[PDB]
Structure formats: structure tokens, C-alpha cells
Amino acid sequence: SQACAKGCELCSEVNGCLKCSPKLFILLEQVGVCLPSCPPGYFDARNPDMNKCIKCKIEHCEACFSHNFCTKCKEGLYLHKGRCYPACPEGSSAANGTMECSS
Amino acid sequence: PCPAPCACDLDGGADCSGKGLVTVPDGLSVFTHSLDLSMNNITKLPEGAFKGFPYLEELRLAGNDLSIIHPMALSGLKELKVLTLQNNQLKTVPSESLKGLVSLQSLRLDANHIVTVPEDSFEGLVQLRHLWLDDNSLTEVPIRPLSNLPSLQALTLALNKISHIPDYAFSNLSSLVVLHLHNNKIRTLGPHSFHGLDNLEALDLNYNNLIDFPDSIRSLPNLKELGFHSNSITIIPDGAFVKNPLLRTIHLYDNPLSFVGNSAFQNLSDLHFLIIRGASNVQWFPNLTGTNNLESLTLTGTKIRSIPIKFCQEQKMLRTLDLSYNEISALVGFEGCSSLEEVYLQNNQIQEVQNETFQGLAALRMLDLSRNRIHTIHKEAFVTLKALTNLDLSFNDLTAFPTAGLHGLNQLKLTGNPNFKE
């Protein structure tokens, strides 16, 4: 288009922003946005071509590192490795003062 | 409470970002934690700018153009939980700036242009958990500075220039779970390279330059998610995974496969998703005997002309099957695969469908027979699939297309029949 300035390399009101200025990620669903560090519960992913940032398959996760690894669990639950459980499995005992699972 | 530019919010958290500033904010909220300083023009960081802020948990320095950081600029504030430095001009690991943070659980160094990684790096950071180095200039796995991180369960080395991983390179990371090596120059891997990670469930070798199958994974007992793709591997050997019975995911696609080991996919039992594509020279459908549970299977681009008569005896778990783009000249009972939903047979040599071929598939939805040699469809059973919705018969030898049990098809592709052509 013409004179679309803001934050992204090629922006058209026809279906939102595309091809973000490096190095930033795109968002989706109205329709498409460009920013750093995709919000919860997305995880930031990077490729050479596409900076597409995705949603984790890990249940109730605020911040993901990957498909199946979660860095910050949701307020209710305990984090053991990459996966989030309501009850710290034993397995290993729970910690306290913060929700984490320590072995 | 609220310094002017910054958007003071919630309880602890503060947001100064976007936009936008140089140096730090005027107002020091001394009881504040979780500062977002990202998305600004900040040239350098002066020492003590973070001394004025104690109790701090998470700090976002991302989005800045930052050439250099003062070694004491972080003041050694002991409460910092996570630090995001990504998308900055840092030409090296600020190992001196990072000393004295014992509370750091997560580091983002990615999107920097970083070449040199000092041997004293990541010292004291033993509470560290998840580490980002990607879209850097790295030409070598930073071994020694990586060995100060006993508690690290997430590491990413991807989008770099790393061409070779020496043996014992990961030796001292005992807690590691996920390792991303993807998008490198990687050609050779030391036989012992993955020695030391007994906790790794996830290995990503995709988009590399590999020649031979990475037997280095023989040292991975807990391995579950595995890929190496868009490599040059020509061969999958016998007992390739024998040390890895916990694999539930394997993406080997886009590899110039030639021979595949009979004993290679046998007895897996945990395997769920298996993706093979672009193996042009493989003539025989792999022996999966022992592997009875698969949700999703893909064989594409092969010369395989046939399918095991017994294949669907043991496959009762299977939702999604893609055999597209092979040499398959005939068919076989798909009953027993009843869990089936998406079936892709397009671009094969199949000339026939039979009453009992699809007999008893309650779950079948997408069915792809396009681009085949099909002429007749024996005793016309699609009747048994109530779920069938998308059906593609396009481009076959058909003069007539049997209709029964086609209720509720949303899409039907009839084109190119019969063709003839010829």
C-alpha cells in the first residue's frame, strides 16, 4: 500500500500486517500484527524466512519455550520440567514460596 | 509512584516500552518488580542504573540497539529472575555483566549478533533454566561456558553457523530436556556429542548439513521428540533407535533416503507420529513389526509399490495416514484401522477400490485418490463411512463414479475422468 509506516515492513489493511521488520514476530486472529516476544500463551519461534510465533500444546501455560516445553506455568499450577500439573507428581516433591517442582 | 513516560500498572510490574526513551526513568519506584524496558533507543547501559532498583524479578532489555554493557551495570542485584537481552547489537556475551545473578532462571541473548562467547561466561548462574542463543553468529558450541549450568533444562543454539559438534560437548548438562540445534551448517556430529544429557526428551537437528545418521542419540535414554530434517542423510540403519524406546515423535522428512534398516522401526511401541517425505530411492515399506500404536504415519515421495497385507491388523490406533506420491500399484484391507480419519493416497498407481477396502471406517473424513490409475470401484462401498466429507477422485480412468453412502459430502472432486488423454 501507500504510507503505512508503523513497525512493519509491508502493511496492508487488506488482512493486516505482513513481513515484519527484522527481527520481530507476527500475530494472528484480526488479522495479523507485528511485535517482539509474542504474548501469553504464545511462544516466540524463529526461522530464516518466517518469524511465526506459535501457541504451545502444553495445558494452561503462560510462557512457552517450545511446543512441549513450558517455562512459566499458569497461576494455579506446578511446573515439573516442561509440563504443568495441578499436583506435583512423585516422582519428586514440591517446593514452596513459589510454584516449582524440585527433585 | 509513576515515572512519566513509563506506564505504571498493576502492582509490581512497570512498562516503559513503545515508546520510547534513552537511558532509565526518572522516578525510582523502589518497591517495584517486573520492569519492561524493551523497545527503545538505548545506546549503552551505565553502572548503577539498576542499583537503584532492588527486589526486581524480571527485566526486559529486548528491542533496544545496545552495543555494550558495563560489567557492574546490573549491580549484582541478587533477586533478578529472568533477563531478556534479545534483538540488540551486542557483539559478545556480556559475561562480566552477568556475574552475580544467582536468581536468574532464564536468559534471552537471541537476535543479537554474537560471535565470541568468553570461557568465563554464565559463571554463577547455576539457577539458570532456559537459555536463548539464536540468530547469532556463533561458529562453535560454547562448551566450557555451557558447563557452568547444572540446572539448565532448556537450551537453544539454533539459527547459527555451528558446523560441528565435538564429543562430550554437552557432557556437564545433566538436567537438559530440550536442545535446539536447528538451522546451522552442521555436517559431522561426534559419536559422544550427546553424552551427558540423560534428561533430554527433545532433540532438534532439523535444517542442517548432516551426511550420516546421528548415532550420537544412542546416549539419549529419555528421548521423546526427535527430528533431523532437510539434512543429507542417505541412510537409516538397523537398531537406530534401539536405545530410545521412549520416542513418541520422529521427523526425518526431506532426506535423500536410500536404504532403510529392517530392524530400525521395529519394537518402538511408544511411537505416535512418524514423518517421512522425499525419500526417492526407498523400495520397501518399512518393517513396523513391534510398533503397534501410531496416531499418524507419513510416507511420501518413495518408490514403494505395495503395502503389507498385515499392516492394519496391528495399527488400530491410527488416525492419519498419508501415503501420497508413491509407486503403490494396488490396495489392501483398511478395516482394523478403524480409528482412521484422514487418508491420502494421491499420486499413486492404484487402479481399483473394493467393497471391503474401506469396509468399516466410521471415522474416515478426508479421502484422497486423485492422480491415480483408478477405473472401476468394486461393489461400490463408500456406504459404510458416515463421516466421509471430502472426497477426491480427480484424474483417473473412471467412466462412472459409484454413488452410495455419499450423504453429507461437502466436497467432491470429479475432474479429469476419464482421461484419455491416453
PDB file of N, CA and C in Angstrom, chain A residues 3-74:
ATOM      1  N   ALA A   3       2.113   4.711   2.229  1.00  0.00           N
ATOM      2  CA  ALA A   3       2.303   5.364   3.524  1.00  0.00           C
ATOM      3  C   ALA A   3       1.690   4.597   4.688  1.00  0.00           C
ATOM      4  N   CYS A   4       2.008   3.308   4.781  1.00  0.00           N
ATOM      5  CA  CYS A   4       1.759   2.564   6.010  1.00  0.00           C
ATOM      6  C   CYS A   4       3.105   2.437   6.735  1.00  0.00           C
ATOM      7  N   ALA A   5       3.278   3.244   7.779  1.00  0.00           N
ATOM      8  CA  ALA A   5       4.568   3.397   8.456  1.00  0.00           C
ATOM      9  C   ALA A   5       4.926   2.418   9.582  1.00  0.00           C
ATOM     10  N   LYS A   6       3.919   1.884  10.274  1.00  0.00           N
ATOM     11  CA  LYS A   6       4.100   1.549  11.687  1.00  0.00           C
ATOM     12  C   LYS A   6       4.646   0.140  11.922  1.00  0.00           C
ATOM     13  N   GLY A   7       5.925   0.085  12.296  1.00  0.00           N
ATOM     14  CA  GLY A   7       6.541  -1.093  12.883  1.00  0.00           C
ATOM     15  C   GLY A   7       6.794  -2.300  12.000  1.00  0.00           C
ATOM     16  N   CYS A   8       6.226  -2.303  10.798  1.00  0.00           N
ATOM     17  CA  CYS A   8       6.253  -3.499   9.958  1.00  0.00           C
ATOM     18  C   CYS A   8       6.564  -3.157   8.508  1.00  0.00           C
ATOM     19  N   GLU A   9       7.281  -4.051   7.840  1.00  0.00           N
ATOM     20  CA  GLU A   9       7.933  -3.720   6.576  1.00  0.00           C
ATOM     21  C   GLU A   9       6.937  -3.538   5.442  1.00  0.00           C
ATOM     22  N   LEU A  10       5.981  -4.454   5.342  1.00  0.00           N
ATOM     23  CA  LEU A  10       4.901  -4.305   4.378  1.00  0.00           C
ATOM     24  C   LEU A  10       3.540  -4.478   5.053  1.00  0.00           C
ATOM     25  N   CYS A  11       2.784  -3.389   5.153  1.00  0.00           N
ATOM     26  CA  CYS A  11       1.493  -3.414   5.847  1.00  0.00           C
ATOM     27  C   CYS A  11       0.307  -3.020   4.958  1.00  0.00           C
ATOM     28  N   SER A  12      -0.672  -3.908   4.865  1.00  0.00           N
ATOM     29  CA  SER A  12      -1.862  -3.626   4.081  1.00  0.00           C
ATOM     30  C   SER A  12      -3.115  -3.887   4.912  1.00  0.00           C
ATOM     31  N   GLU A  13      -4.026  -2.913   4.958  1.00  0.00           N
ATOM     32  CA  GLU A  13      -5.285  -3.078   5.697  1.00  0.00           C
ATOM     33  C   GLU A  13      -6.081  -4.242   5.111  1.00  0.00           C
ATOM     34  N   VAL A  14      -5.645  -4.712   3.944  1.00  0.00           N
ATOM     35  CA  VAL A  14      -6.175  -5.946   3.415  1.00  0.00           C
ATOM     36  C   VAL A  14      -5.474  -7.008   4.255  1.00  0.00           C
ATOM     37  N   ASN A  15      -6.251  -7.696   5.092  1.00  0.00           N
ATOM     38  CA  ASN A  15      -5.735  -8.696   6.029  1.00  0.00           C
ATOM     39  C   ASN A  15      -4.550  -8.345   6.947  1.00  0.00           C
ATOM     40  N   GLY A  16      -4.472  -7.111   7.444  1.00  0.00           N
ATOM     41  CA  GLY A  16      -3.451  -6.756   8.429  1.00  0.00           C
ATOM     42  C   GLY A  16      -1.994  -6.769   7.978  1.00  0.00           C
ATOM     43  N   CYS A  17      -1.075  -6.703   8.940  1.00  0.00           N
ATOM     44  CA  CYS A  17       0.360  -6.590   8.649  1.00  0.00           C
ATOM     45  C   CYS A  17       1.000  -7.903   8.168  1.00  0.00           C
ATOM     46  N   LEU A  18       1.930  -7.787   7.224  1.00  0.00           N
ATOM     47  CA  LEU A  18       2.698  -8.930   6.728  1.00  0.00           C
ATOM     48  C   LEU A  18       4.188  -8.567   6.735  1.00  0.00           C
ATOM     49  N   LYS A  19       5.056  -9.577   6.607  1.00  0.00           N
ATOM     50  CA  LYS A  19       6.517  -9.395   6.503  1.00  0.00           C
ATOM     51  C   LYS A  19       7.081  -8.325   7.435  1.00  0.00           C
ATOM     52  N   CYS A  20       7.178  -8.635   8.725  1.00  0.00           N
ATOM     53  CA  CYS A  20       7.658  -7.666   9.715  1.00  0.00           C
ATOM     54  C   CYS A  20       9.140  -7.284   9.566  1.00  0.00           C
ATOM     55  N   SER A  21       9.481  -6.081  10.026  1.00  0.00           N
ATOM     56  CA  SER A  21      10.862  -5.614  10.039  1.00  0.00           C
ATOM     57  C   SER A  21      11.639  -6.546  10.947  1.00  0.00           C
ATOM     58  N   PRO A  22      12.837  -6.979  10.516  1.00  0.00           N
ATOM     59  CA  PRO A  22      13.553  -7.914  11.388  1.00  0.00           C
ATOM     60  C   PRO A  22      14.056  -7.191  12.639  1.00  0.00           C
ATOM     61  N   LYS A  23      14.100  -7.878  13.780  1.00  0.00           N
ATOM     62  CA  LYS A  23      13.621  -9.248  13.877  1.00  0.00           C
ATOM     63  C   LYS A  23      12.445  -9.310  14.838  1.00  0.00           C
ATOM     64  N   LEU A  24      11.252  -9.399  14.270  1.00  0.00           N
ATOM     65  CA  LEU A  24      10.037  -9.355  15.064  1.00  0.00           C
ATOM     66  C   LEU A  24       9.123 -10.468  14.587  1.00  0.00           C
ATOM     67  N   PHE A  25       8.088 -10.760  15.356  1.00  0.00           N
ATOM     68  CA  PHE A  25       7.229 -11.882  15.050  1.00  0.00           C
ATOM     69  C   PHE A  25       5.850 -11.365  14.658  1.00  0.00           C
ATOM     70  N   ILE A  26       5.102 -12.200  13.941  1.00  0.00           N
ATOM     71  CA  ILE A  26       3.739 -11.878  13.544  1.00  0.00           C
ATOM     72  C   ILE A  26       2.720 -12.543  14.462  1.00  0.00           C
ATOM     73  N   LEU A  27       1.569 -11.892  14.610  1.00  0.00           N
ATOM     74  CA  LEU A  27       0.469 -12.397  15.417  1.00  0.00           C
ATOM     75  C   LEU A  27      -0.714 -12.606  14.477  1.00  0.00           C
ATOM     76  N   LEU A  28      -1.738 -13.331  14.930  1.00  0.00           N
ATOM     77  CA  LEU A  28      -2.936 -13.591  14.124  1.00  0.00           C
ATOM     78  C   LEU A  28      -4.233 -13.609  14.962  1.00  0.00           C
ATOM     79  N   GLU A  29      -5.376 -13.553  14.273  1.00  0.00           N
ATOM     80  CA  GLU A  29      -6.710 -13.674  14.886  1.00  0.00           C
ATOM     81  C   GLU A  29      -6.979 -12.714  16.046  1.00  0.00           C
ATOM     82  N   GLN A  30      -6.829  -9.961  14.097  1.00  0.00           N
ATOM     83  CA  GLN A  30      -7.799  -9.550  13.091  1.00  0.00           C
ATOM     84  C   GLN A  30      -7.213  -8.469  12.172  1.00  0.00           C
ATOM     85  N   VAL A  31      -6.443  -8.862  11.158  1.00  0.00           N
ATOM     86  CA  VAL A  31      -5.847 -10.187  11.089  1.00  0.00           C
ATOM     87  C   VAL A  31      -4.341  -9.985  10.840  1.00  0.00           C
ATOM     88  N   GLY A  32      -3.541 -10.291  11.857  1.00  0.00           N
ATOM     89  CA  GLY A  32      -2.095 -10.114  11.843  1.00  0.00           C
ATOM     90  C   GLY A  32      -1.552  -8.824  12.446  1.00  0.00           C
ATOM     91  N   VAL A  33      -0.475  -8.965  13.219  1.00  0.00           N
ATOM     92  CA  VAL A  33       0.147  -7.880  13.991  1.00  0.00           C
ATOM     93  C   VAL A  33       1.641  -8.190  14.102  1.00  0.00           C
ATOM     94  N   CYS A  34       2.474  -7.168  14.269  1.00  0.00           N
ATOM     95  CA  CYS A  34       3.913  -7.373  14.325  1.00  0.00           C
ATOM     96  C   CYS A  34       4.473  -6.821  15.643  1.00  0.00           C
ATOM     97  N   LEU A  35       5.193  -7.662  16.393  1.00  0.00           N
ATOM     98  CA  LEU A  35       5.790  -7.232  17.667  1.00  0.00           C
ATOM     99  C   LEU A  35       6.959  -8.140  18.099  1.00  0.00           C
ATOM    100  N   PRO A  36       7.749  -7.724  19.115  1.00  0.00           N
ATOM    101  CA  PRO A  36       8.729  -8.645  19.718  1.00  0.00           C
ATOM    102  C   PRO A  36       8.107  -9.514  20.801  1.00  0.00           C
ATOM    103  N   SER A  37       8.639 -10.711  21.030  1.00  0.00           N
ATOM    104  CA  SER A  37       8.216 -11.525  22.174  1.00  0.00           C
ATOM    105  C   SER A  37       6.699 -11.772  22.292  1.00  0.00           C
ATOM    106  N   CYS A  38       6.180 -12.675  21.460  1.00  0.00           N
ATOM    107  CA  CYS A  38       4.750 -12.971  21.426  1.00  0.00           C
ATOM    108  C   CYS A  38       4.160 -13.218  22.811  1.00  0.00           C
ATOM    109  N   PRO A  39       2.966 -12.659  23.064  1.00  0.00           N
ATOM    110  CA  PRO A  39       2.364 -12.606  24.395  1.00  0.00           C
ATOM    111  C   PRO A  39       1.954 -13.984  24.884  1.00  0.00           C
ATOM    112  N   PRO A  40       1.490 -14.087  26.145  1.00  0.00           N
ATOM    113  CA  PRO A  40       0.960 -15.379  26.583  1.00  0.00           C
ATOM    114  C   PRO A  40      -0.300 -15.648  25.791  1.00  0.00           C
ATOM    115  N   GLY A  41      -0.596 -16.905  25.484  1.00  0.00           N
ATOM    116  CA  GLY A  41       0.225 -18.042  25.847  1.00  0.00           C
ATOM    117  C   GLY A  41       1.068 -18.503  24.683  1.00  0.00           C
ATOM    118  N   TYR A  42       1.387 -17.582  23.778  1.00  0.00           N
ATOM    119  CA  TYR A  42       2.252 -17.896  22.641  1.00  0.00           C
ATOM    120  C   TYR A  42       3.711 -18.163  23.016  1.00  0.00           C
ATOM    121  N   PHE A  43       4.413 -18.846  22.121  1.00  0.00           N
ATOM    122  CA  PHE A  43       5.865 -18.954  22.279  1.00  0.00           C
ATOM    123  C   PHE A  43       6.631 -18.345  21.090  1.00  0.00           C
ATOM    124  N   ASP A  44       7.739 -17.667  21.369  1.00  0.00           N
ATOM    125  CA  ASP A  44       8.468 -16.987  20.313  1.00  0.00           C
ATOM    126  C   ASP A  44       9.273 -18.029  19.545  1.00  0.00           C
ATOM    127  N   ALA A  45       9.089 -18.091  18.236  1.00  0.00           N
ATOM    128  CA  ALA A  45       9.840 -19.034  17.423  1.00  0.00           C
ATOM    129  C   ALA A  45      10.504 -18.248  16.317  1.00  0.00           C
ATOM    130  N   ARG A  46      11.583 -18.771  15.754  1.00  0.00           N
ATOM    131  CA  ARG A  46      12.285 -18.036  14.714  1.00  0.00           C
ATOM    132  C   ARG A  46      12.720 -18.962  13.589  1.00  0.00           C
ATOM    133  N   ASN A  47      12.630 -18.468  12.358  1.00  0.00           N
ATOM    134  CA  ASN A  47      13.193 -19.171  11.221  1.00  0.00           C
ATOM    135  C   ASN A  47      13.948 -18.128  10.401  1.00  0.00           C
ATOM    136  N   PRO A  48      14.689 -18.564   9.364  1.00  0.00           N
ATOM    137  CA  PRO A  48      15.311 -17.604   8.444  1.00  0.00           C
ATOM    138  C   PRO A  48      14.272 -16.780   7.658  1.00  0.00           C
ATOM    139  N   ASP A  49      13.304 -17.489   7.085  1.00  0.00           N
ATOM    140  CA  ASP A  49      12.251 -16.860   6.302  1.00  0.00           C
ATOM    141  C   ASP A  49      11.207 -16.236   7.211  1.00  0.00           C
ATOM    142  N   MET A  50      10.507 -17.101   7.943  1.00  0.00           N
ATOM    143  CA  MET A  50       9.328 -16.711   8.718  1.00  0.00           C
ATOM    144  C   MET A  50       9.547 -16.681  10.246  1.00  0.00           C
ATOM    145  N   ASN A  51       9.158 -15.566  10.868  1.00  0.00           N
ATOM    146  CA  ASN A  51       9.258 -15.358  12.325  1.00  0.00           C
ATOM    147  C   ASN A  51       8.039 -15.783  13.129  1.00  0.00           C
ATOM    148  N   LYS A  52       7.200 -16.598  12.494  1.00  0.00           N
ATOM    149  CA  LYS A  52       5.914 -17.034  13.031  1.00  0.00           C
ATOM    150  C   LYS A  52       6.034 -17.480  14.481  1.00  0.00           C
ATOM    151  N   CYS A  53       5.217 -16.908  15.360  1.00  0.00           N
ATOM    152  CA  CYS A  53       5.267 -17.263  16.779  1.00  0.00           C
ATOM    153  C   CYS A  53       4.016 -18.047  17.183  1.00  0.00           C
ATOM    154  N   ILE A  54       4.184 -19.194  17.834  1.00  0.00           N
ATOM    155  CA  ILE A  54       3.057 -20.108  17.945  1.00  0.00           C
ATOM    156  C   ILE A  54       2.531 -20.358  19.360  1.00  0.00           C
ATOM    157  N   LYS A  55       1.437 -21.111  19.418  1.00  0.00           N
ATOM    158  CA  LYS A  55       0.803 -21.492  20.668  1.00  0.00           C
ATOM    159  C   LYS A  55       1.324 -22.872  21.054  1.00  0.00           C
ATOM    160  N   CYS A  56       1.527 -23.069  22.347  1.00  0.00           N
ATOM    161  CA  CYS A  56       2.019 -24.335  22.864  1.00  0.00           C
ATOM    162  C   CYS A  56       0.899 -25.356  23.000  1.00  0.00           C
ATOM    163  N   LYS A  57       1.261 -26.634  22.953  1.00  0.00           N
ATOM    164  CA  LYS A  57       0.320 -27.734  23.188  1.00  0.00           C
ATOM    165  C   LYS A  57       0.355 -28.158  24.652  1.00  0.00           C
ATOM    166  N   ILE A  58       1.081 -27.391  25.452  1.00  0.00           N
ATOM    167  CA  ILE A  58       1.131 -27.634  26.883  1.00  0.00           C
ATOM    168  C   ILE A  58      -0.046 -26.918  27.567  1.00  0.00           C
ATOM    169  N   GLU A  59      -0.824 -27.676  28.349  1.00  0.00           N
ATOM    170  CA  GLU A  59      -2.045 -27.179  29.002  1.00  0.00           C
ATOM    171  C   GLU A  59      -1.822 -26.030  30.009  1.00  0.00           C
ATOM    172  N   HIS A  60      -2.616 -24.970  29.880  1.00  0.00           N
ATOM    173  CA  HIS A  60      -2.616 -23.835  30.809  1.00  0.00           C
ATOM    174  C   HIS A  60      -1.243 -23.217  31.075  1.00  0.00           C
ATOM    175  N   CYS A  61      -0.512 -22.846  30.021  1.00  0.00           N
ATOM    176  CA  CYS A  61       0.851 -22.300  30.135  1.00  0.00           C
ATOM    177  C   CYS A  61       0.939 -20.805  29.784  1.00  0.00           C
ATOM    178  N   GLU A  62       1.549 -19.986  30.645  1.00  0.00           N
ATOM    179  CA  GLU A  62       1.725 -18.562  30.314  1.00  0.00           C
ATOM    180  C   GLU A  62       2.802 -18.338  29.237  1.00  0.00           C
ATOM    181  N   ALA A  63       4.008 -18.858  29.477  1.00  0.00           N
ATOM    182  CA  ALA A  63       5.134 -18.642  28.560  1.00  0.00           C
ATOM    183  C   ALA A  63       5.820 -19.940  28.161  1.00  0.00           C
ATOM    184  N   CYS A  64       5.799 -20.257  26.864  1.00  0.00           N
ATOM    185  CA  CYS A  64       6.409 -21.492  26.375  1.00  0.00           C
ATOM    186  C   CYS A  64       7.794 -21.212  25.803  1.00  0.00           C
ATOM    187  N   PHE A  65       8.695 -22.177  25.948  1.00  0.00           N
ATOM    188  CA  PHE A  65       9.953 -22.170  25.193  1.00  0.00           C
ATOM    189  C   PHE A  65       9.853 -22.923  23.860  1.00  0.00           C
ATOM    190  N   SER A  66       8.890 -23.833  23.771  1.00  0.00           N
ATOM    191  CA  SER A  66       8.759 -24.694  22.607  1.00  0.00           C
ATOM    192  C   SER A  66       7.347 -25.291  22.555  1.00  0.00           C
ATOM    193  N   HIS A  67       7.153 -26.248  21.651  1.00  0.00           N
ATOM    194  CA  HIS A  67       5.893 -26.966  21.521  1.00  0.00           C
ATOM    195  C   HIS A  67       5.493 -27.520  22.872  1.00  0.00           C
ATOM    196  N   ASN A  68       6.311 -28.469  23.317  1.00  0.00           N
ATOM    197  CA  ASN A  68       6.128 -29.234  24.545  1.00  0.00           C
ATOM    198  C   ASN A  68       6.944 -28.849  25.794  1.00  0.00           C
ATOM    199  N   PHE A  69       7.657 -27.732  25.753  1.00  0.00           N
ATOM    200  CA  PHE A  69       8.283 -27.252  26.975  1.00  0.00           C
ATOM    201  C   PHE A  69       7.693 -25.913  27.433  1.00  0.00           C
ATOM    202  N   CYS A  70       7.246 -25.854  28.693  1.00  0.00           N
ATOM    203  CA  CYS A  70       6.695 -24.619  29.279  1.00  0.00           C
ATOM    204  C   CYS A  70       7.610 -24.024  30.358  1.00  0.00           C
ATOM    205  N   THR A  71       7.958 -22.745  30.193  1.00  0.00           N
ATOM    206  CA  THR A  71       8.814 -22.006  31.129  1.00  0.00           C
ATOM    207  C   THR A  71       8.104 -21.415  32.345  1.00  0.00           C
ATOM    208  N   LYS A  72       6.900 -20.898  32.135  1.00  0.00           N
ATOM    209  CA  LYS A  72       6.123 -20.318  33.227  1.00  0.00           C
ATOM    210  C   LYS A  72       4.722 -20.894  33.239  1.00  0.00           C
ATOM    211  N   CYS A  73       4.376 -21.579  34.324  1.00  0.00           N
ATOM    212  CA  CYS A  73       3.084 -22.218  34.398  1.00  0.00           C
ATOM    213  C   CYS A  73       2.023 -21.176  34.724  1.00  0.00           C
ATOM    214  N   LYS A  74       0.756 -21.569  34.643  1.00  0.00           N
ATOM    215  CA  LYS A  74      -0.345 -20.653  34.968  1.00  0.00           C
ATOM    216  C   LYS A  74      -0.548 -20.600  36.486  1.00  0.00           C
TER     217      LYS A  74
END
